[PDB]
């Protein structure tokens, strides 16, 4: 403190992504002689069997005020992108590491060269490196593939 708000958030969101989307950061409230309730921040406080939080013998060394990771109900599908495109992007990544060709089509011209479509992926044809329709298919070789920003550079030959 401080620590800006927009700063305390960014790190809290970053930590939340270090856990699976099914476990939540929650604080315990009121531990009974049988069950311990956690407040994950939802309408229904999570209850957990107090027995699993005991020692090698008896007693439970956890107390109210401590955060525990509790699971969320997975209760309970975008068929359009399921038109086979995640693997369509892995085809470039595998054909790029093996140094192999991939079927693609030159749709239209652009500033740097041309736009190419390979299994639904848009790539860059440097044009360095006489047509045209209907976008005839051609065997391309992938030279530069940016993993994070979807940008890929393809070579003619």
């Amino acid at each position: 403190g401080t620590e800006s708000f927009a700063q305390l958030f960014e790190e809290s969101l970053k930590e939340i992504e270090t856990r699976p989307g099914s476990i939540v950061r929650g604080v315990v409230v009121a531990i009974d002689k049988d069950v311990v309730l956690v407040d994950a921040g939802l309408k229904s406080e999570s209850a957990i069997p107090a027995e699993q939080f005991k020692n090698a013998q008896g007693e439970l060394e956890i107390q109210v005020g401590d955060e525990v990771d509790v699971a969320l109900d997975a209760v309970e599908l975008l068929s359009r992108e399921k038109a086979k495109r995640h693997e369509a992007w892995i085809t470039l990544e595998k054909a790029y590491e093996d140094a192999e060709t991939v079927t693609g089509v030159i749709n239209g011209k652009v500033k740097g060269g041309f736009t190419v479509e390979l299994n639904g992926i848009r790539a860059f044809l440097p044009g360095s490196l006489t047509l045209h329709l209907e976008g005839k298919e051609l065997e391309f070789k992938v030279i530069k593939l940016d993993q994070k920003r979807n940008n890929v550079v393809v070579s003619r030959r």
């Binding site: 403190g1 401080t2 708000f5 305390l8």
Partner: protein, 650 residues
């Protein structure tokens, strides 16, 4: 050469210090001879100030029976207009017009020619008798709205009261004709043709295009006739209806306003200064104090070139609301220019220009001017804490005894207005000389900068003042307690510290149980931080917006007070019309409106849009206030002006 005599030579006519010695250098010893060829050699000086625009001055009116005279005399700055010598000139001219029934302004000009040049040479501004008109009737009356507007009115069967009211109305509504029928029967036919084309544009039919035009004509030919205008003291009726009730009739009127029709050349102080220029260590920089200053002096003394020197020498040495700003090692400055007396008071009120000290600029070649008195006086009336003198153009003052007897003049003038004259830092330097690179004079610029750092004190930071938080809303957090919200204006509120709730209702006390933000919970509330203050015991029903939290016994409530006020003009989105003795608007203090009534100063009967004015306000509810607090004046949301609490009352 012979500096004791040259001091005697300034009388008569406060001529330039160097003009006096140079006048003795040629024809030496004989003070009487020096005066004479110095008098005739003033006429040429007057023709050179001729080019200087003079859209300022005064309007004067005098009535002797069934005969009144209106007059306009122009000077360069309203500092000269408030000046005794200038005023004595105008009054001398007005008497001559009424005395002889002089209506030809050229006869009047030729008569007071010798007198004005002896006045021009002494003041250094372009002074001219612009225009003079005479009015006659069965009953004459005159209204003088300050010195900027003056009116003459002729009537029949009307007492003086009704005519005085017409005169005031004429001053506020600026009609051009008596009755709507008095407008030019053929000059209006041109405006009809301008509106018949804007209607026939789209635009038919002809019987409809003409009918709409002639409709707007009778509308914009009653907005120019006195009879057609709503009477400013009773807008529901027209002046015509007002006259037809008292069985009266206006025979004529004349309305002068200072500078009417003169090209009001706009001036960009920042542009002029800037155009002339360049011809913990971390926590230190963000904590450097901010100080506001301003140059105030004669026009031809080059305040604008001194401020251009202060910027460039501080840049050459340290490497870096029309305002200009520069930096010294210890503090950051904001430099504004005070060209007019009313101009600065308007900004002093709005908050758009608050000086912590002023730089009176006197050209040593001239010495103080007659209007230098008004310059220093302005500083008194806005409450300028400190004045520093910079004698400019010292490089052209031959004898050093001449520079010192200029200091004595300046220090005496300051003393004549409660300023520490015996202690006033006076820097004998040269502005026009420090822009070349003359270190001898460039060092004098740094010397002035040193006094700004040493003479002008660091304003009190809001953190060092007593705690005060303008409440914006109250909340009753079930399970916890009452809490108010707002941004701490001054001071520091700590948990456990006690506070008062001041304003609107009886002031009550409570203890701070906690300070709170959204990001976290805090221990203290520092000035400038938005917080909620949890309060002990007191309930939400007993608090409300408009009140303030404050350290017990720091600020107290008041209902009656004196104030400087500025009323917004028409083009500023302010009132359209004037208000009078019973004005009852809304006064906005920090967070809320409180209704109040005004007491206009003696002599003042009508306040117009764009007016400065003092007035004693009495609020319907008490308000936590102290001297210097600023407030908005609003008419149901519409800001119509603002003011400054000058004196609390009882």
């Amino acid at each position: 050469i012979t500096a004791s005599l040259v001091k005697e030579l300034r009388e008569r006519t406060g001529a330039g210090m160097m003009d006096c010695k140079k006048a003795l250098t040629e024809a030496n010893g004989d003070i009487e001879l020096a005066i004479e060829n110095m008098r005739k050699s003033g006429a040429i000086k007057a023709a050179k100030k001729a080019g200087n625009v003079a859209a300022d001055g005064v309007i004067k009116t005098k009535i002797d029976g069934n005969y009144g005279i209106i007059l306009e005399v122009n000077c360069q700055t309203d500092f000269v207009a408030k000046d005794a010598g200038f005023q004595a000139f105008a009054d001398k001219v007005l008497d001559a017009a009424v005395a002889g029934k002089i209506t030809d302004v050229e006869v009047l000009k030729a008569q007071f020619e010798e007198e004005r040049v002896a006045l021009v040479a002494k003041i250094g501004e372009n002074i001219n008798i612009r225009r003079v008109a005479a009015l006659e009737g069965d009953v004459l009356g005159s209204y003088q709205h300050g010195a900027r507007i003056g009116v003459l009115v002729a009537a029949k069967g009307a007492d003086e009261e009704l005519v005085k009211h017409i005169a005031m109305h004429v001053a506020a509504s600026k009609p051009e004709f008596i009755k709507p029928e008095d407008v030019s029967a053929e000059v209006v036919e041109k405006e009809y043709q301008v509106q018949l084309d804007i209607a026939m544009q789209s635009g038919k039919p002809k019987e409809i295009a003409e009918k709409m035009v002639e409709g707007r004509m009778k509308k914009f030919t009653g907005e120019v006739s006195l009879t057609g205008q709503p009477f400013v003291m009773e807008p529901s009726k027209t002046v015509g209806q007002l006259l037809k009730e008292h069985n009266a009739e206006v025979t004529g009127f004349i309305r002068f306003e200072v500078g009417e029709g003169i090209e009001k050349v706009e001036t960009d102080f920042a542009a002029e200064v800037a155009a002339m220029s360049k011809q913990s260590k971390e926590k230190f920089e963000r904590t450097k104090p901010h100080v506001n200053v301003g140059t105030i002096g004669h026009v031809d003394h080059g305040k604008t070139t001194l401020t251009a020197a202060i910027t460039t020498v501080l840049a050459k040495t340290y490497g870096g609301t029309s305002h200009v700003e520069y930096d010294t090692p210890t503090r950051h400055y904001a430099h504004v220019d005070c060209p007019g007396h009313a101009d600065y008071v308007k900004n002093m009120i709005t908050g758009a220009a608050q000086m912590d000290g002023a730089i009176l600029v006197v050209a040593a070649t001239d010495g103080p001017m007659p209007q230098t008195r008004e310059h220093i006086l302005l500083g008194r009336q806005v409450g300028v804490p400190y004045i520093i003198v910079f004698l400019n153009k010292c490089d052209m003052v031959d004898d050093e005894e001449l520079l010192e007897l200029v200091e004595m003049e300046v220090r005496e003038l300051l003393s004549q207005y409660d300023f520490p004259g015996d202690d006033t830092p006076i820097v004998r330097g040269s502005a026009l000389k420090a822009l070349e690179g003359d270190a001898e004079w460039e060092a004098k610029i740094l010397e002035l900068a040193g006094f700004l750092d040493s003479y002008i004190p660091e304003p009190e930071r809001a953190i060092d003042k007593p705690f005060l938080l303008p409440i914006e809303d109250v909340f009753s957090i079930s399970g916890r307690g009452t809490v108010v919200t707002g941004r701490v204006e001054r001071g520091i509120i700590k948990v456990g510290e006690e506070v008062e709730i001041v304003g609107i209702k009886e002031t009550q006390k409570s203890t701070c149980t906690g300070v709170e933000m959204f990001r976290k919970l805090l221990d203290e509330g520092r000035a400038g931080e938005n917080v909620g203050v949890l309060l002990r015991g007191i309930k939400r029903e007993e608090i409300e917006r408009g009140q303030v939290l404050a350290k017990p016994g720091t600020i107290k409530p008041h209902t009656k007070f004196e104030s400087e006020v500025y009323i917004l003009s028409k083009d500023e989105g302010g009132r359209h019309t004037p208000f009078f003795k019973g004005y009852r608007p809304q006064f906005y203090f920090r967070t809320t409106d409180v209704t109040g009534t005004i007491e206009l100063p003696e002599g003042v009967e009508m306040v117009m849009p764009g007016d400065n004015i003092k007035m004693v306000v009495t609020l319907i509810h008490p308000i936590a206030m102290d001297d210097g607090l600023r407030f908005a004046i609003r008419e149901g949301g519409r800001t119509v002006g603002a003011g400054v609490v000058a004196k609390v009352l009882s």
